[PDB]
Structure 1
């Protein structure tokens, strides 16, 4: 996938060091000759020694005639045919360029409303839009679609990927993110009812869900009492259970804690709320519905990604230079790449959002003698993720001094001198006591004064391909085993975890974890510092449970644990088969 080649004839034209030097040369091409070749050399050294990892579109394409490098798009649909159409059109355009899509369709009004016919037929239409450029309308093309838990149609929406059922009631080839806030969870804990509403019947409630929890509570209880409003009551237990049952059987009903996405966020939610995520649940950016594919008042969010290889750095202060390099390379790519939809160019040029994560986290823990499952890694993770965020923020602040803050910098909590260390879930104090080692107060004043080049810097994405290039463990995940196995036309491809020889006992394999608590605490600790979100998995081995069945009690307790430690999203649920 990386090396420039003839896919017709089988010819390969380059070697890896040419790819790396030329990716560096292209990204830094506009730099003044005084610094240009120094940045090139330094970025080249960082990537070719595996300290920094880039996404496949960059690795395959930067140096070639293409300008298609956007792989991650977020589109919010409004409650109108015009916006439904524009959304569909934008999806088709972006999936033909092989981007993953996050679709917010939770504003579409429910079936029976004075969208008389409902959400589902529009969801089906989003699916064919996503699959429009796929082999036999299935292989390739991927999307996650988002809606609120209190949506009137939610029980129908929850079961969309269930194998059995009428084809008319099923939309199986997209994933789903259910959006939840504290009030929903409180109803569960109190054994109370959740009231379902169409977003069209409840003025200000949708907006308040994301932006203002006290206003949401006020509007929600009000509308629950107004018998003129169309509504339905369901047991919170039954609703949550249904969601968790669908999450468990498919692994692909996801969760977004939308209050956490907005109380602990680079963005002021009164201006630029986060109301959805992307395909993989780590991206959290503002959006605005389109009226037309070419609507200049819409906002589609894009994010350019990279990662630091935690296993290739000897110490954390190396991140200062890596952060400078990664922030600058990706910021330059924002000006270089094409924008097929005007509203996507608006998001990228306005906010200049980046999502830099990590790979080789399991390996890093192992070589430091820590584990996921027992809390031994808590303070180390606090320390590690402080350094990442501090240095990312520092690099982007310096870039702002040199080149200008991003046009819409004033919409960030950053602009008001608010930092991630000010707004994190307080419960984190009970599970780590690592102090801050860096001068955040000095950084705070510098950001207040010079701003940031980029409204977001950090997001913890899954990796597979880039991890493999470095022989790194993927993202923040424990490996399933010591040897990974891939099918190919060239034979069985094996990869052994790094330094198996000296570290086999130091590793904690995924199914060796007694449970999810320790891992979720690490996620929570990471999230203290991360600007966007984290593709956090939950895992269950049936053979650890009586009669091999995972109890709903444990599914819900883990969900609650995630919430309590300020976890913004939950991605895949993996169930061991075995």
Structure 2
């Protein structure tokens, strides 16, 4: 609580103050053990700082280093602040300014604006952008979607190499493997027999452990995508199980289902499902919707696969999620039907955290650059105040700033492999998200499940999508649309919510925007993909992304600051209530002397109906370009509950039915 203004003070004492000097130290750094010059700032950002040192040096407000809570600062200290000899060289303000310069280059005024907005916590960029912006090979991208190059040892190992090269410089990976022939399929060149996915997965698994994001940084992180008809599907979904048969597990990877509607239809009808090897039943990953169903159905009649009962696979899916939190679930038809990149071809996968939906192929590895807007920063106490209100106007303004940021990142990025550069330069996607929706709702006195919260959620996501497309239309006016604009839904005036066949809420003028996009283009094929903010939310001191809090009382013991305020304000906060909190896993329900309104406001995710989560996810989804990383939380899980959740999500038209399933 106070140990923050204590440990930040210590860094100040143990660090150089003047920004242009820290930059000098970074830039002139030599790796001692090898005596090699190891500059930690690009030449270009170095020169820019030296030619602007007074302006740059004087713009920085180090008081702002005290915006960070204790965990936030320590998060910054451990992994983000550049170090010289195991000693931290950057103060948080310094990091921020390096990033704003990393992103903006010669445009100093744009860099100053980003410095102010980030230092004041209106928004942040994703971890890799913070780690690497303004450094010599700035790999600022968070996400890569990799296509298995070919069903051959040559393509498998070309793919493995690619993944290694990517993991080297710190992305997370989604990799689709639908085209690999299954167990027992014939191998012609040697008259042999395939052992299927598992032994191939195990090679990728080891690669992930080996290539730890730059040498002792973080284990490689790959999610694998598979359509539920693949004949190896039962072992794939179990890849994370704790119990026996070590040679058949792949514990360092994450399995994801790329589900066609037909699977769901068959599950609900209590029908049959057919398992195929892709050699016997080709092209299934390369179509979707009615076209997929006609193709699948024919192959199924032609006897080309093995028939089981659908509900047998399902029950196994459900078992695996209950035990491991995986596999993830992303609906292939929804993704494909409702994607502005549909003119590129069929989208075969999502990504490590199920927010990105972008087209990939053997020659194109889809990329995304991310940032998240801090939703609390736009609450103003009103002019009388106390009403508090929500400044949608400023939100719109900042989302436009961040849009332009993520666009510069595209052009200034170092891409690990050529397949990533080719994709990104062509198609130009970007990913805006949010953090602290829970905090916003709290501050404003709205319960998560309330109709008021429902409305705010809709308006926030409408404003972010509108702002991002407005900014992207602006950039297309200056710089031209992205190469692949023509033929896109957006070129026809079909925007995300149109694809859900809905009217927009209408807080913004979508018609003028649409008129404008049709005439001038947009600069980015996609703009929205709300992400977990698993790390960045913790730097800023807010609840991750768009989920309710999991607990009003984490563990160092820290009680929800909004709840604490309230308890003291009511003459009820004593030792007998702090007790009823570490024991109650952070709940206040049923608790004796506590007003109903606080109970309704400080509900945990474990106490909110997942029908409420799904509904709200489905509401904002009309304003999301890509998808979003929808964690599901079940207290006492049953197959019946799990089933109704997936199905409710599925019939709502979600793209990401489920990220992790969390239990207790």
Give the corresponding residue for 1:155. 234
Residues matched between the structures, number: 535
Regions of 4+ moved over 6 Å = 135-139
Aligned to 1:567: 654
Write the distance in 2 (CA, Å) between the matches of 1:460 and 1:9.
Answer: 34
Describe how 1:541-560 pairs up with structure 2 within 5 A.
541-542=635-636, 550-560=637-647
Q: Deviations over 1:319-341 (max 9, x none)?
A: 23212211111111112121221
Q: Secondary structure at the match of 1:409?
A: coil
1:499 and 2:562 matched: yes
Larger Rg: 2
Residue from 522, 532, 536 that aligns with 2:630: 536
Tell me the SS of whatever aligns to 1:344: helix
Say which of 188, 193, 197 aligns to 2:276: 197
Select 1:280's aligned residue among 353, 359, 362: 353
Specify whether residues 89 and 450 from structure 1 end up closer, same or farther in structure 2 by C-alpha distance, changes over 3 A only: same
Measured in 1, the distance between the counterparts of 2:250 and 2:461 equals 38
Determine which of 221, 224, 234 is the counterpart of 1:145. Answer: 224
Distance in 2 between residues matched to 1:254 and 1:48, nearest whole Å? 35
CA distance, structure 1, for counterparts of residue 445 and residue 262 of structure 2:
40
Whole-angstrom CA distance in 2 between matches of 1:565 and 1:56:
32
Q: 1:2 to 1:82 in 2, by over 3 A?
A: same
1:108-141: CA deviation from partner (whole Å, max 9, x where unpaired):
1111223622111111111112222249999621
Q: Residues 374 and 235 of structure 1: is their aligned pair in 2 closer, same or farther, counting only changes over 3 Å? A: farther
Residue 376 of structure 1, CA deviation = 4.9
Q: Is the 8 A contact 1:366 1:503 kept in 2?
A: no
**What is the distance in 1 between the residues matched to 2:372 and 2:177?**
30
Displacement of 1:80 in angstroms is: 2.5
Q: Are residues 1:413 and 2:507 paired?
A: no
Verify the 8 A CA contact 2:462 2:505 in the aligned structure 1: no
Matched, 1:241 2:315: yes
Matched, 1:263 2:345: no
- CA-to-aligned-CA distance 1:53-72 (integer Å, 9 cap, x gap): 11122223223334222332
Distance 1:334 1:509, change over 3 A: same
Q: Report deviation, 1:159.
A: 1.9
**TM-score, normalisation: structure 2:** 0.77
Q: Name 1:294's counterpart in structure 2.
A: none
Q: What is aligned with 1:545?
A: none
Indicate the larger mover: 165-174 or 82-91.
165-174
What RMSD, in angstroms, separates the aligned Cα atoms of the two structures?
A: 2.2
Q: In terms of mean alpha carbon deviation, does 112-121 or 468-477 score higher?
A: 112-121
Residue 256 of structure 2, aligned match among 156, 166, 177: 177
- 8 Å Cα contact 2:128-2:170 kept in structure 1: no
CA distance in 1, matches of 2:349, 2:325: 19
SS of the residue corresponding to residue 312 of structure 1 reads: helix
Deviations 1:321-366 (Å, cap 9, x if unpaired)?
2122111111111121212211110111111111110001111122
Q: CA deviation at 1:374?
A: 5.4
Equivalent residue of 2:266, what SS?
A: helix
The structure that is helix-richer by fraction is 2
Q: How does 1:24-173 map to 2 (within 5 A)?
A: 24-30=100-106, 36-77=107-148, 78-114=150-186, 116-134=194-212, 140-173=219-252
1:104-503 alignment, distance < 5 Å: 104-114=176-186, 116-134=194-212, 140-209=219-288, 213-227=289-303, 229=304, 231-268=305-342, 271-289=344-362, 298-314=363-379, 315-373=391-449, 376-410=452-486, 412-424=488-500, 435-485=505-555, 492=556, 496-497=559-560, 499-502=562-565
CA change 1:138–1:226 in 2 (3 A) is farther
Return 5+ residue gaps in structure 2 as ranges. 1-78, 188-193, 380-390, 568-597
TM-score, with structure 1 as normaliser = 0.88
* CA distance in 2: counterparts of 1:498 and 1:22, whole angstroms: 32
Aligned in 2, Cα 1:377/1:234: closer, same or farther, shift over 3 Å?
A: farther
Q: Can you give the 5+ residue segments of structure 1 that lack an aligned partner in the other structure?
A: 31-35, 290-297, 486-491, 543-549
What's the CA shift string for 1:164-207, capped at 9, x where partnerless? Answer: 23223222221111111221111111111111111222233221
User: CA 1:9/1:264 → structure 2, altered by over 3 Å: closer, same or farther?
Assistant: closer
- Whole-angstrom distance in 2 between the partners of 1:454 and 1:181: 27
Q: Which has the higher contact order (CA 8 A, sep 6+)?
A: 1
